[PDB]
Amino acid sequence: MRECISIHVGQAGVQIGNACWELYCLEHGIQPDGQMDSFNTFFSETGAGKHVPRAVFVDLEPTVVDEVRTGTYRQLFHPEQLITGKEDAANNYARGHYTIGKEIVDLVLDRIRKLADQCTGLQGFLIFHSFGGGTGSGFTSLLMERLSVDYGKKSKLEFAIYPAPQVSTAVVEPYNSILTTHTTLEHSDCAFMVDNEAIYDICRRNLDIERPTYTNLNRLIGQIVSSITASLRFDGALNVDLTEFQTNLVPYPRIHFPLVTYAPVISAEKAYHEQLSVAEITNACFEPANQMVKCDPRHGKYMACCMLYRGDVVPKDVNAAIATIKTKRTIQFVDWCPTGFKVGINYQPPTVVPGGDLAKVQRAVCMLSNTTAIAEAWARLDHKFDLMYAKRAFVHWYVGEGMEEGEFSEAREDLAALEKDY
């Protein structure tokens, strides 16, 4: 026995946390109130037939928190773990990092500290947020360094909604993205991808949902986190811990930004049309378009590859499929990283939702790597930042939060050094 803590900041973070808790509740049979020992990794035993999520819901705006506390799962969540803000940063990293974040970071730090107090087997921290959101950038970053300074070497996992190259809710998104990336770089143990446009494209072409909604995105995150945490929440042939995830993909602290991909995303009518075998599902998932990242991995080199099989998957078939994956030349690896393969097998089949886009299947695989194509996105973001900051636009907004342009500039050069480190 062991536990983990999930952190949700901003609208995207709150929605993601709610969806993930919906998964964890329906997978273990939790009714909306909390009733009917691996489920203790995310829920706490007190009283009689009771469980509550080990999470904190915080946002500078109370709209999403109000929406959460109006669902049928009010009884499921403790009221005190929901935090309501008053002044949304409005896509401003500095606003949510200094003006409102500094006076509300205390209660959250403080009581996630108790969440660790009753969880002596705290494996790590889960963070869900968005770069585009000013709250989800600033408050998330500051609480990230607060976690680092209050826990030391404790493992921490970040799930960030990176704005897409052509999808941006706010035009000031480069400022928030660059600022948060420079601020939390040294402490970000592992940060993933989310490309909204790639999610929409995959849903429209794979699930063939011409009119999807953010619920599809919500379980897109939900299924990813479920596949990641199945090892901790269910036994398997070779379970994988959170520590090994950062051990394999962080030989150097500078590069800790791996991309994620799921296989498969198939509707029930199309699930009738295809049953999964290891070779086909892996080679489909390794296909660049199947990746939920809008960056072709074949442009650069591959760091490492991690497989997360769940269900009735034969390890020998895994080895054979992975080998025949290796031999083909569409896949290339760095010279000094010949053997960077880790496989995690779990016996728990992926869980379905009623009325969901995904089809109920006994087996699945999670696609886990850190390709060099992320450098393309980083360079494009840096170029956009240079263009839109060259005339110094929207800077006065961050100035009114009380800093001058210097920190913007050296964050730009820090991220440039990160980009050229490849």
Binding site: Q11, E61, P62, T63, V64, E67, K86, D88, A90, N91, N92, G134, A164, P165, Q166, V167, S168, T169, A170, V171, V172, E173, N196, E197, Y200, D201, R204, E210, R211, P212, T213, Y214, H383, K384, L387, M388, A390, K391, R392, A393, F394, V395, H396, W397
Partner: protein
């Protein structure tokens, strides 16, 4: 939560605010008296932003009515939905500045500033959290501009952190309704560059031509102008008032629209706008709107953005569609309008969607954009001011209210610096 207090100045401003209030009563399911009858919880869940907690299951608008004459007062109160306002919010003068900025700002504004500050402070304190303000007035008029300037000054010195927008009505360049209206615009802009966080410029002749041609009406009236104004109204404020997959508020727009403190003038937008025998034949799809987002026909404040360059664009949508189509449409808009767009502000389209469409339309689209086209309007205003200030005509009315020469000189210098900065951006 995030309460917004409405203050209306001038006859046009009072009419606009009233029409807004009936439109909000439609959108939130409020009858002519104040009772709620909406069929969905979404209308009444966030009714507190524009309404207050009234006894007997009622709701009253969070509005402040200010004028120097009670003529439009009586017409508005005796008009439709006049009983939804308490008599206390109606505070009026008895002299009238007579389309004079100095009179309405110093002579008659001296005995109205106390009342307007008292009522706005009462509205602010009686609410939970005042997110911001919204003011409507006409820069062509003299009194309304003076009330706008006085209120923005008092708000800035009282609530420097609470942002707002001002929906001022700039006088039409083609028609000189008032001889001394250049002074009014001069002083109003000189106070707006200084006491307002962001401003939308609403020009008459552009909406007149839209009603004439796009709507295909042979008899345009103030009613249609107030209707389109209320559509702009709802389009900007629906993200805060109604739940959305991409939630937004006035603070988000202000952050996304203001690159420099003095560069805060934007030109609002609405679409689709089609008649009965075109709507049943037009495509009710996004491309029909994206061809309508960028055009000098359905264009709001009479200065063509094609001559200048767009600063950045904000687009709010209300309906049932996916988001990726919007993103690719915005990308295509950049791809084809690159020359009309700015090269050094990549992805300058602000994309957000409110889930709930307005009453009677399953889409509405509000085009919030900024371009250096307003440079032409400001330069023409400056040259007109120079033209009839070189002759020193009609200065006696202002100098009789405690005016001075070099004051107007630094006013015109401020607009000169503003237009020079806008040209430098161009």
């Amino acid at each position: 939560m995030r309460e917004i207090v409405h203050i209306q100045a001038g006859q046009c401003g009072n009419q606009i605010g009233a029409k807004f209030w009936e439109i909000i009563s439609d959108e939130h399911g409020i009858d002519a008296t104040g009772a709620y009858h909406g069929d969905s919880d979404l209308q009444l869940e966030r009714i507190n932003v524009y309404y207050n907690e009234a006894s007997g299951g009622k709701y009253v608008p969070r509005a402040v009515l200010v004028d120097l004459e009670p003529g439009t007062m009586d017409s508005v109160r005796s008009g439709p939905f006049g009983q939804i306002f308490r008599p206390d919010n109606f505070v009026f003068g008895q002299s009238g500045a007579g389309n004079n900025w100095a009179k309405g700002h110093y002579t008659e504004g001296a005995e109205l500033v106390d009342s307007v500050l008292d009522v706005v402070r009462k509205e602010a304190e009686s609410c939970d959290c005042l997110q911001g303000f919204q003011l409507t007035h006409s820069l062509g008029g003299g009194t309304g501009s003076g009330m706008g300037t006085l209120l923005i000054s008092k708000i800035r010195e009282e609530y420097p952190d609470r942002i707002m927008n001002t929906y001022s009505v700039v006088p039409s360049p083609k028609v000189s309704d008032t001889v001394v209206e250049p002074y009014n615009a001069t002083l109003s802009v000189h106070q707006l560059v200084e006491n307002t966080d962001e401003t939308y410029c609403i020009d008459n002749e552009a909406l007149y031509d839209i009603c004439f041609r796009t709507l295909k009406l042979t008899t345009p009236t103030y009613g249609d102008l107030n209707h389109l104004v209320s559509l702009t109204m709802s389009g900007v404020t629906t993200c805060l008032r109604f739940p959305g997959q991409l939630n937004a508020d006035l603070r988000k727009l202000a952050v996304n629209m203001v690159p420099f403190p003095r560069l805060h003038f934007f030109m609002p937008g609405f679409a689709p706008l089609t008649s009965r025998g075109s709507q049943q034949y037009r495509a009710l799809t996004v491309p029909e709107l994206t061809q309508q987002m960028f055009d000098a026909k359905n264009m709001m404040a009479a200065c063509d953005p094609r001559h200048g360059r767009y600063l950045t664009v904000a687009a709010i949508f209300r309906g049932r569609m996916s988001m990726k189509e919007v993103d690719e449409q915005m990308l295509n808009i950049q791809n084809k309008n690159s020359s009309y767009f700015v090269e050094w502000i990549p992805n300058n389209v602000k994309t957000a969607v409110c889930d709930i469409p307005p009453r009677g339309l399953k889409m509405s689209a509000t085009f919030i954009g900024n371009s250096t086209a307003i440079q032409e309007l400001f330069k023409r205003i400056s040259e007109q001011f120079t033209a009839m200030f070189r002759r020193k005509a009609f200065l006696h009315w202002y100098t009789g209210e405690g005016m001075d020469e070099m004051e107007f000189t630094e006013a015109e210098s401020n607009m000169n610096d503003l237009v020079s900065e806008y040209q430098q951006y161009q």
